[PDB]
Amino acid sequence: MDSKTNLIVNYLPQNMTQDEFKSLFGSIGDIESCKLVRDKITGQSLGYGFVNYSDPNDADKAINTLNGLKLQTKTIKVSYARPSSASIR
């Protein structure tokens, strides 16, 4: 069905984690399913998580407001979750 629910976040700050990542994109749209990067060994974050909204309108809004957030000493930025470029030559 036409919907497009791809919201990949990157540039996550240390404090940000599975809990700070849920509330962050949680008070913006019904993330049909979140999924921040969280190794299954020590638990170090890769500095980016995955999020899928329910509609494309709520997803473009999380990007029209969180796309380029400034931090005390870091730069966070939202980005549509897309697959590899898939090049050839």
Side-chain angles (χ1 to χ4, degrees), residues 16-77:
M16 192 142 242
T17 196
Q18 174 168 217
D19 45 79
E20 160 161 290
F21 191 48
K22 199 194 203 144
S23 92
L24 200 293
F25 281 72
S27 293
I28 305 191
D30 180 280
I31 297 146
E32 264 284 279
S33 212
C34 321
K35 186 126 242 181
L36 193 160
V37 182
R38 194 94 145 95
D39 31 28
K40 233 225 266 293
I41 295 185
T42 196
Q44 229 241 303
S45 90
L46 279 185
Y48 82 90
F50 281 120
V51 165
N52 308 284
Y53 279 33
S54 203
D55 326 312
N57 308 154
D58 303 280
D60 62 35
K61 105 81 50 44
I63 284 167
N64 91 296
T65 294
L66 313 140
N67 168 265
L69 282 139
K70 309 198 207 120
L71 289 141
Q72 186 183 147
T73 60
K74 280 138 195 106
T75 322
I76 156 170
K77 256 192 88 197

